[model samples]
Target: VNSFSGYLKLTDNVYIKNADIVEEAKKVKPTVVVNAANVYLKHGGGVAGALNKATNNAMQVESDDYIATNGPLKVGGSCVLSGHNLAKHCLHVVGPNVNKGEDIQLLKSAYENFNQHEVLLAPLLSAGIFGADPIHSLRVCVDTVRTNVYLAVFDKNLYDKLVSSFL
Candidate 1:
């Protein structure tokens, strides 16, 4: 088995890492899993897309209601919704659509909006769907969240890339 485990620290409490997100979720069983979503909850691409499918698009349905009720969220803003297939809660925030030179900044702000929690598993936000640099986005997640963070990588190639970067 190819075992990979490593972490980058933004503070004594916060960390970013490379591991399977689903596996980490199973292990940590976090109350919430932060998800990257568009303002309209267009989870048609990237991580949100996959998660939407996994949850049978339940998040999208709820997000639609949220938008209908509260209006769309600005880029850095977020809303908490029900977690259909993953956790007890889903924190949906708008990650930048692309690496528009401000993806990291927007992600930082988004992370700042999250509520404090004990166990959280996050992906390299904006890296997959938004095409931002994985390392840079990962740093944003680490630097912003005050709590301990666990990052999930979906594949071995990506895992190796993250592991190598830490070397």
Candidate 2:
């Protein structure tokens, strides 16, 4: 099942739930689901790969078209695209790879940008392939979200550690 999770309320509607990214996104169907993506926008690994696979590769095709037309997304930049079967829109963001000016604050900005919307489904940004500290990344996710968010962690042990950070 979905991590048998923990919860923390960040705002009136914004709360964090430890669960699987795609599964929660599919169920909650947030206004936008974030992709923990790269500058190239390739949905080939990590959350990108999983969500793209769930969308039957159509998400990747949209991503391919986006990349071809817009060029690579710089770190901290985000673009809107079809959510396919997941959500209404997919917000593709390239979190900093521990780069200067693109580190923690950029991650915060990424989350904050979606505050104007109603709901968000986001993974642990920059905490995986982008190599950000999980604790800090989770903190940024919690602190910056102004909309309802199903924060999927994808690991029982890691989810415990992250949720424990609240205690």
Candidate 3:
């Protein structure tokens, strides 16, 4: 494993940290940014809200096609949308709500389905608005993403713990 001062690195180029998700995405300028969302394809709340604002609400219109083609998207499913603000493309994944235990599997599936990209920026899936434990969520994300994965977290303590816990 590779180690950084404040970040924990895993095999397959996965990195996790507590940092501003959107701002860090800008720094990395990743090829793809993954947004945690519900099946409705709406970017009205949570991480989606920040991404929507950054992209000038472009996801709303771009999401229409995803909704029309894949309405009520399955919990483990995802759809690709345009990325305007931080990256060249956006991959919106449907995260589980309430069923915390199921989140890891769904997350794994989403990551498995994602198309390959050299760099990817993603949040701790199913942890924030979806209410899953951050540590559990991070584990699944780190295990699943194949390319360089940047996990943006907001809480410094949580980030530190994540790095230390794995050691």
Candidate 4:
């Protein structure tokens, strides 16, 4: 977590008010900001609020911030994720559902894109919300993300597989 004052050049740019990710991303110029936020919690920062803050305090400045929401939104909606792909590196977070379901692969693909490509903000995927086995879930999420990363390297035809691994 970063200090709000440190990130916000103009305090008003990140006022304690509601603002969209894209709107906030604009104020800050960067392309690789990872925002591991949970906007639907009791501490719901709201889409605008969270993004605004992230933008204010960004890392790896680039055009797209590969962001993800670690926590689940109790009240599901498309506003935060699905509704805004054009807004920087916006990703529609979907989880707390069946981990064994296709969503796992879906998440893998998203992670792949972000990790392989230049991502900006990312959700709080470290939060184990939907998994029968918390330990395995954690391992799976982290490891698979790594797998995707390696896949990117492998896909590029730049490395040799000295040993086999699981994803």
lDDT of 1 by residue, 33-147 (tens): 7777777787786778877777777878887888888888888777778876677787787777675545556777777765466656677667775777777775666567776
For candidate 2, the lDDT comes to 0.77
Pairwise TM-score winner, candidates 3 and 4: 3
Give the alpha carbon lDDT tens digit for every residue of 69-120 in model 4: 3433321111232212223344333333344333443344333434443323
Clashes of 1: 0
Q: Native-vs-model 4 lDDT?
A: 0.31
**Residue-wise C-alpha lDDT for candidate 3, range 85-137, written one tens digit per residue:** 77778888876765545545566776665546666778877877788877787
Candidate 4 has a TM-score of 0.29
Worst 10 residues of 1 by lDDT: 1-10
Candidate whose lDDT is highest: 2
Q: Rank the candidates by lDDT, best first.
A: 2, 3, 1, 4
Output the better candidate (1/2) by lDDT: 2
How do the predictions measure up, each by TM-score?
0.79, 0.84, 0.83, 0.29
lDDT of 2 at 145: 70
What TM-score would you give candidate 3 relative to the actual structure?
Answer: 0.83
Best by TM-score: 2
Indicate whether candidate 1 or candidate 3 has the larger TM-score: 3
Runs in model 1 deviating more than 4 A are 1-11, 14-28, 99-104
The residue pairs found clashing in candidate 2 are none
